Amino acid sequence: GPDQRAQKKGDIILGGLFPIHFGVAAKDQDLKSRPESVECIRYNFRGFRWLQAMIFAIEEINSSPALLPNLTLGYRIFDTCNTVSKALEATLSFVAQNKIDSTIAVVGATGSGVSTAVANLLGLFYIPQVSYASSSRLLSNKNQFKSFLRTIPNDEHQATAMADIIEYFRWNWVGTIAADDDYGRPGIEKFREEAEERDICIDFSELISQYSDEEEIQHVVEVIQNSTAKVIVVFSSGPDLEPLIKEIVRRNITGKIWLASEAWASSSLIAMPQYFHVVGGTIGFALKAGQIPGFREFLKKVHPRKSVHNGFAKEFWEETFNCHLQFRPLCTGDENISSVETPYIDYTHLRISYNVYLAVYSIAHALQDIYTCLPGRGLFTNGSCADIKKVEAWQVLKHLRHLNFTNNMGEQVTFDECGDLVGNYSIINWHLSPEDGSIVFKEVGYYNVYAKKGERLFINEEKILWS
Amino acid sequence: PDQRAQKKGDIILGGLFPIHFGVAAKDQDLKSRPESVECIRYNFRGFRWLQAMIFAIEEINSSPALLPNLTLGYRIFDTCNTVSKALEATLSFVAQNKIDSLNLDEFCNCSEHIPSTIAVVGATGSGVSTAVANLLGLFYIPQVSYASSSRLLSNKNQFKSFLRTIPNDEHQATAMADIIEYFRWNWVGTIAADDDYGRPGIEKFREEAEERDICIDFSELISQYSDEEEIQHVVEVIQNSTAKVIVVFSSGPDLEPLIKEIVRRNITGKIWLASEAWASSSLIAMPQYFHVVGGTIGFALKAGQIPGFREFLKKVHPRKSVHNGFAKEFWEETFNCHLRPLCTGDENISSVETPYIDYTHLRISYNVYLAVYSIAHALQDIYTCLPGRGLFTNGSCADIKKVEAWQVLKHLRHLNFTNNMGEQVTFDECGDLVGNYSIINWHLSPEDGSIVFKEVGYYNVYAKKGERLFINEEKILWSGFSREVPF
Ligand SMILES: O=C(O)[C@@H]1Cc2c([nH]c3ccccc23)CN1
Ligand SMILES: O=C(O)[C@@H]1Cc2c([nH]c3ccccc23)CN1
Ligand SMILES: *[C@@H]1O[C@H](CO)[C@@H](O)[C@H](O)[C@H]1NC(C)=O
Ligand SMILES: *[C@@H]1O[C@H](CO)[C@@H](O)[C@H](O)[C@H]1NC(C)=O
Ligand SMILES: *[C@@H]1O[C@H](CO)[C@@H](O)[C@H](O)[C@H]1NC(C)=O
Ligand SMILES: *[C@@H]1O[C@H](CO)[C@@H](O)[C@H](O)[C@H]1NC(C)=O
Ligand SMILES: *[C@@H]1O[C@H](CO)[C@@H](O)[C@H](O)[C@H]1NC(C)=O
Ligand SMILES: *[C@@H]1O[C@H](CO)[C@@H](O)[C@H](O)[C@H]1NC(C)=O
Ligand SMILES: *[C@@H]1O[C@H](CO)[C@@H](O)[C@H](O)[C@H]1NC(C)=O
Ligand SMILES: *[C@@H]1O[C@H](CO)[C@@H](O)[C@H](O)[C@H]1NC(C)=O
Ligand SMILES: [Cl-]
Ligand SMILES: [Cl-]
Ligand SMILES: [Cl-]
Ligand SMILES: [Cl-]
Ligand SMILES: [Cl-]
Ligand SMILES: [Cl-]
Ligand SMILES: [Mg+2]
Ligand SMILES: [Mg+2]
Ligand SMILES: [Mg+2]
């Protein structure tokens, strides 16, 4: 498969897909010469941290005598660059054996459009796929996506929560903006429905993307400028929102109340001090934080020399310290992760990282249920058991479907009939640090998804800065 | 990959067609290894589409002028209107390319006689074509769809190798808004197939409706595989709404279960605005639904002609058609027999009415024909390329003895030829072809008792905004029969 990867041999192999870069180099192909492989661009430190959470979980599991005693979990982890084409190249390598007719499960991907394309392929071979971040309602369809599960909740609930917040403040007038993809469009469509139900009037609705040109961006900015709406609901990833926000900042459009979907509510591409005059005071959703003891210390042990199995550690180092590995100064190999602020280690809560950790543990526990299976008490024909020495992916899928374990936070993890894992949301608000000058994500509330109308939303208004 | 239509040649075109309407829905409990899904419900019109591709290729091969050195072969698979079947097929189309991408030729035992697919014709449903395009685009294999009209496929960043001989739905959705504004209708309902055809068609409709101050009372989603509760919910929304006009963006197969239940409950007096995929669908235009579905107003693509195609169609035979492995089941389904009594092998295609041969106009069939000819002409442009005047680096030319798919794509992107109807065929920068629409209205035949598609207007996409619609109000029969409005 692909050149740059994180790989380690084992008895049972987990595939991994993570956005180590935010995108791909805009060399629009006129096809005058044979297309070359496209270059990934813009290092995603947070994504590398996500990838680390998978490697951490696997090492921790292998270090546990109790969990899967006979066996070692290995891995094969690739960079998607947030792009369907790269994700799919990687995925063709995961199914290489099956297609000729060995990867037993896949953790990923991030964007719902990437996970969809991956799922169409993995589902052919009944290889289970557990996404840590793809939240589109479209992936809940088990007729189309037969092998897909996720440790993040479905956006039906988040979109409803957005309508509930607006109704809570007795607002009645908003604008909407959505990424033109399988995350933004179904999220905002559900929002529209719930908003109409609550007599919230929507003054405009625009689409954006990472690749919107100057005219498209200009048009959206003009719609925003010509509207009396103050509250703008935005369902988008950071990369898809960034070009719009840059232009809004350029024109100094001040005083908007931004309501942020979870994909950009914590995005370092948007939460930048020099945008704060436009973007300050945004209110957004975040998933519930989880804890992973020892993960931060593991993170600080990365090294381009010592990390033999993780071929992304090299570029990570070069990007962090702005150097080149043996004029771009050469890296010493002795520099200090703690001296440079990036999202790699500058975080307070683990959210998506926790979902990654749970995705791996879901797979591991499903395998453990195979290991401990007693004849007659199994899930397959005639109460038969699968053989863990010769496990097939479809058996792991079966076990993932019936999985029920208690996680380190004391919570039961099970997947519903659609492969979804239910969850609540935290509500955060963008403040400026008086110490730091940086944007701080203050928790101001939470949303309890499965409570009765009018008992779901808990907000501490006193904590909100409207700028 | 078992049943297929296949024939060797120097240059191979892939094909994808919905020979069945769907698959046997059977939730797998995964107590034993999953088996492949069963395709169900023979699609005679789709088999005709597949025939138009084979016909075009035989015609081209019979032409001394067009591609003289070379023969075009083909490898054509049934999608059953499903992503998974389409993708199994597509993995065969890219088998060679894929081995190269992963260096798999060295690390496992791999053949040296895997024939290369140079272009693919298909698929039908936009949801299927999108998934196929993600894969074909990886290898820059050109894909020319004859029916996938979603605006999403116009995105060349995502779908690098996709083109089509059908217009995208942006104008069609606009036309629906124009018609409503024309009749001063308001508080309309919308229904869309929950896929990449229905959702973006209705989204564009919503935008245009808003621009014209048309209010929408409900918006529901449906599919072929909706369960009883889902269908019941949508029928209840329709029952509880004051809306008389309902805009429906869906294929026939995705609409059929909803319509059956609407008929079951005798919901009458609705004005249905039909997207092009179901405005002529034999699954919906059935006499016994006419009390619900009569008077539907919908869109139809421009017809084209293919001399000799009808006669080619009548030549099909389970014995003689060695290359077309769908001919067997076609025969059995047409004559209700087995190779249910045994088939003689001598029965007559003209004795049984199915969509195979019971048609007036070739529309999607013509798109299929043009898709194949688009590929052939792009190849011809390679054949006739003169050094310095070529499309590649330094005005260089491709070698037609060693053509690569990406070069065909390049040529398709700049293709400009004149078709048998005297029209220029070119694709815009998004891989799209422009087309007008006829507006049709569902009448009942006084002779036949069957549903007839009366032209009552047209939509000219070349005219200025607000001057594209023409309707002849006098020709509309409301609820299918009434010249008096309202009644
Ligand atoms: O499904 C999707 O496309 C989004 C992608 C996404 C989510 N959360 C994120 C955090 C960082 C980067 C990307 C994301 C939630 N679902
Ligand atoms: O893009 C899609 O999914 C639809 C599929 C489709 C169209 N027209 C048709 C006629 C007959 C059967 C199917 C179709 C237009 N685009
Ligand atoms: C917004 O206002 C500008 C300046 O008055 C006007 O000319 C333009 O047509 C408007 N643009 C949009 C997209 O509404
Ligand atoms: C935007 O407008 C403010 C006043 O609201 C003005 O000071 C300046 O032009 C802009 N703000 C900044 C931080 O540049
Ligand atoms: C999961 O297991 C716990 C502990 O036995 C049990 O209480 C809970 O009811 C189970 N949940 C499901 C959904 O099976
Ligand atoms: C959300 O939190 C509430 C309050 O702690 C709890 O009762 C509920 O079960 C949680 N829901 C989910 C889906 O985790
Ligand atoms: C429609 O009919 C009545 C409205 O009062 C009610 O019993 C039923 O639940 C309604 N259904 C829907 C989908 O609105
Ligand atoms: C259904 O209702 C209409 C009258 O509005 C008509 O088509 C038909 O006579 C009715 N049939 C039944 C069984 O109710
Ligand atoms: C195609 O060819 C004709 C003349 O043969 C030319 O005039 C026309 O502009 C061409 N079409 C396009 C879209 O370039
Ligand atoms: C569309 O309609 C008008 C004639 O009504 C004409 O200008 C144009 O040629 C038509 N285009 C096509 C592709 O038929
Ligand atoms: Cl990803
Ligand atoms: Cl799947
Ligand atoms: Cl981000
Ligand atoms: Cl098809
Ligand atoms: Cl493509
Ligand atoms: Cl149909
Ligand atoms: Mg262990
Ligand atoms: Mg809009
Ligand atoms: Mg020839």
Swiss-Prot record, chain B:
- Changing S126A: what effect? Abolished calcium-induced G-protein-coupled receptor activity
Known consequence of changing P200S?
A: In HHC1; decreased G-protein coupled receptor signaling pathway
Which residues bind phosphate per the record? R45, G46, F47, R48, W49, R363, I364, S365
Effect annotated for changing E276A: Abolished calcium-induced G-protein-coupled receptor activity
Residue segments, region Ligand-binding 2 (LB2): 168-303
Outcome following mutation: Q407R: In HHC1; decreased G-protein coupled receptor signaling pathway; does not affect cell membrane localization
State how changing S365L affects the protein, per the record: Abolishes G-protein coupled receptor signaling pathway
- Mapped to this chain, the residue ranges on the Extracellular side of the membrane are 1-487
Residues annotated as coiled-coil are none
The UniProt site entry described as Important for ability of agonist AMG 416 to activate G-protein-coupled receptor activity is assigned to C430
- Tell me what effect the entry lists for R164Q: In HHC1; decreased G-protein coupled receptor signaling pathway
Q: What is the effect of changing S149A?
A: Abolished calcium-induced G-protein-coupled receptor activity
What result is annotated for mutating T130M? In HYPOC1; increased G-protein coupled receptor signaling pathway
Sites where the protein binds Ca(2+): I60, S63, L66, L67, T79, T124, S149, P167, D169, E210, D213, E276, Y437
Result after altering R48E: Abolishes G-protein coupled receptor signaling pathway
- Spell out the subunit comment: Homodimer; disulfide-linked. Interacts with VCP. Interacts with ARRB1.
In its UniProt entry, what is this protein called? Extracellular calcium-sensing receptor
At the highest ranks, the source species' classification is: Eukaryota, Metazoa, Chordata, Craniata, Vertebrata
GN (gene name): CASR
